[PDB]
């Protein structure tokens, strides 16, 4: 089973990942995890971060340019992902494709049924061959550029509402991880 944990920066996705990992292993399931973007590994990720800190001329000004860099990062990992899906019962990704749809649409003031969200699907899942997650779990919290983080949170909820790329669940900060693991388990 492939699971992506999503949400805005500061939402506390890592803690969820760890909580879920323990709940799955308590239920007798092997678990592997990966975090995106892969800063310090993917040159594409690293240029993208660097660009948001004012490096690389006008790169940050294009949403699609940033989106593309983050896609190329995930694509470089596509074989690792598929490998972990064969090697372990449950594979949990801290951020995945939906992050690109949410930050891009937010940025462009578009909704989940808009162009950017559909572009991300075409590029990442169809063209680049990233496998679609079985579940996407939106960690949606009150308090994690504030304008964009709030709007990205909203777009994310919209992705979950439309079933973008697959089934979702939306959860809060105090979700019970054992209950969540039983819900997600085949």
Ligand X SMILES: C[S@@](=O)c1cc(-c2cccc(OC(F)(F)F)c2)[nH]c(=O)c1C#N
Binding site for ligand X (CB under 6 A): 36-37, 52, 63, 66-67, 70, 95, 99-100, 103-104, 107
Q: Which residue is nearest to ligand X (CB)?
A: 70
Residue 10 buriedness (CB in 10 A; 0-12 / 13-18 / 19+): exposed
Closest CB 37 distance from ligand X, rounded Å: 4
* Distant-in-sequence, close-in-space partners of 73: CB < 8 Å, separation ≥ 6: 36, 37, 38, 42, 44, 45, 48
* Residue number, 46 or 134, with CB nearest to ligand X: 46
* Residue number, 17 or 67, with CB nearest to ligand X: 67
* Residue number, 34 or 181, with CB nearest to ligand X: 34
Q: Are 73 and 36 in contact (CB under 8 A)?
A: yes
> How many other CB atoms are found less than 10 A from the CB of residue 36?
19
Closest CB 173 distance from ligand X, rounded Å: 19
* Residue number, 51 or 181, with CB nearest to ligand X: 51
* Distant-in-sequence, close-in-space partners of 104: CB < 8 Å, separation ≥ 6: 63, 64, 66, 67, 110, 116, 117, 119, 120
Cα-based distances in Å from 96 to 45, 62, 147: 13, 20, 22
Closest CB 58 distance from ligand X, rounded Å: 13
* Residue number, 23 or 160, with CB nearest to ligand X: 160
Closest CB 167 distance from ligand X, rounded Å: 20
Closest CB 89 distance from ligand X, rounded Å: 24
């Amino acid at each position: 089973m492939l699971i992506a944990i999503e949400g805005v920066d500061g939402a506390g996705k890592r803690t969820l990942v760890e909580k879920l990992s323990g709940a799955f292993r308590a239920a007798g399931r092997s678990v592997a995890t990966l975090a995106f973007p892969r800063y310090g590994q993917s040159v594409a990720a690293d240029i993208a971060a660097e660009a948001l800190h004012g490096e690389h001329g006008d790169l940050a000004s294009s949403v699609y340019a940033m989106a593309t860099l983050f896609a190329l990062d995930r694509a470089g990992a596509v074989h690792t992902i598929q490998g972990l899906c064969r090697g372990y019962d449950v594979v949990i990704l801290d951020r995945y494709v939906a992050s690109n749809a949410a930050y891009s649409a937010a940025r462009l003031h578009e909704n989940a049924a808009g162009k950017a969200a559909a572009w991300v699907q075409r590029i990442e899942f169809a063209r680049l061959g990233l496998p679609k997650p079985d579940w996407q779990v939106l960690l949606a919290v009150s308090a994690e550029d504030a304008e964009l983080q709030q709007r990205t949170g909203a777009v994310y909820a919209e992705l979950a509402a439309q079933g973008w790329g697959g089934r979702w669940l939306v959860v809060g900060a105090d979700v019970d991880p054992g209950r969540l693991a039983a819900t997600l388990a085949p």
